[PDB]
């Protein structure tokens, strides 16, 4: 568990997503952006920081990671659809390294979801920012390693589905 | 007729396209990319460098410019849909300034269309490259000024249509 993300790791993830999306003819960037937000809320719903009525709020770790991996899926798809070049990659690592406001205590505050919504309805939300958000969550609440593992598992199953196996 | 393109001119064009596309709910990046290529061939068909059987090949200048403006329309739309940032703009002006192979005699060769097709079926064709192509054609065969004029005229009519006037 390095809990770090390398250039080669990111490039591999983008390549994995690309191979799967190439098999989706109706691929629609506007729809992918909406799916990103919907999947984000589903992940947020597994964290359960607003569910005061629960004895043990928070779903099992493997469930939370699986729902987080959905956010990553659409984040990678959106990046690929917009053309993720070497200079986009550099800006991503700079933005990721120097993000100051997405740390553990902030992400554990249930009011964080209002800030996220303020980003989500802005036309100018970048594909880079969407990726920074999902990797900071992994880095801060989980590990980047488990997120990558859950996503790769999911995509293997996804290829089996589209293969009819 | 400066036959040049400034940063402010490009930003204005992108803003014009953005306002119009915001009124198109079914906006689909994959469809816009195909439309770019189809409109490209329509413009090429007005140049008529392959129509050996004509006495006066080439349609009137205003027709050629109008069809070129269609290429620009989809080129701007694709750029906007992919998120055209300040660094994309800088790379565009560098690519445009230092393009060596899209000059007048090349563009007047009817075999140029095979090279274009080799670019058009490549998944990795960038929105920047699509814009470099259309502005070099304007610069070399027409002027950038007439292209901008034809596009602005077209978009004014387009807003009148979507306004129901
Ligand atoms: Ca989900
Ligand atoms: Ca891009
Ligand atoms: Ca046309
Ligand atoms: Ca972009
Ligand atoms: Cl309740
Ligand atoms: Cl004939
Ligand atoms: Mg650094
Ligand atoms: Mg220069």
Numbering used by the authors:
A (entry chain D), B (entry chain D): 1 to 165
Would you copy out the relevant sentences from the publication that reported this structure?
SaPIs are clinically relevant pathogenicity islands, residing passively in the host chromosome under control of the SaPI master repressor, Stl. Some Staphylococcus aureus phages encode dimeric instead of trimeric Duts, which are completely unrelated at both sequence and structural levels. The crystal structure of the ϕDI Dut described here represents the first structural characterization of this group of dimeric Duts, revealing particular features. Remarkably for unrelated proteins, our results indicate the de-repression mechanism used by dimeric and trimeric Duts is conceptually identical, involving dUTP as a second messenger turning off Stl-Dut interaction.
Based on the crystallographic data, we decided to mutate Ala73 to the hydrophobic residue Leu. As we previously indicated, Ala73 is placed at the bottom of the nucleotide binding pocket occupying the position responsible for deoxyribose discrimination, thus its substitution for a bulky hydrophobic residue (Leu) should abolish nucleotide access. The three-dimensional structure of ϕDIA73L proves that the protein is well folded, showing a dimeric arrangement generated by crystallographic symmetry. Superimposition with wild-type ϕDI structures, both apo and dUPNPP forms, confirms an identical folding (RMSD < 0.5 Å) and rules out any conformational impact of the A73L mutation. A close up view of the active center shows that the new Leu is accommodated without steric difficulties in the nucleotide pocket, with low impact on the surrounding catalytic residues. However, the C-terminal helix α8 presents a higher stabilization compared not only with the apo form but also with the nucleotide complex, allowing us to model all the residues except the last four. In this way, the A73L mutation seems to mimic the nucleotide stabilizing of motif V in the trimeric Duts. However, the structural characterization of the ϕDI Dut A73L mutant has shown that this mutation promotes a compact conformation that could be stabilizing the dimer, supporting our proposition.
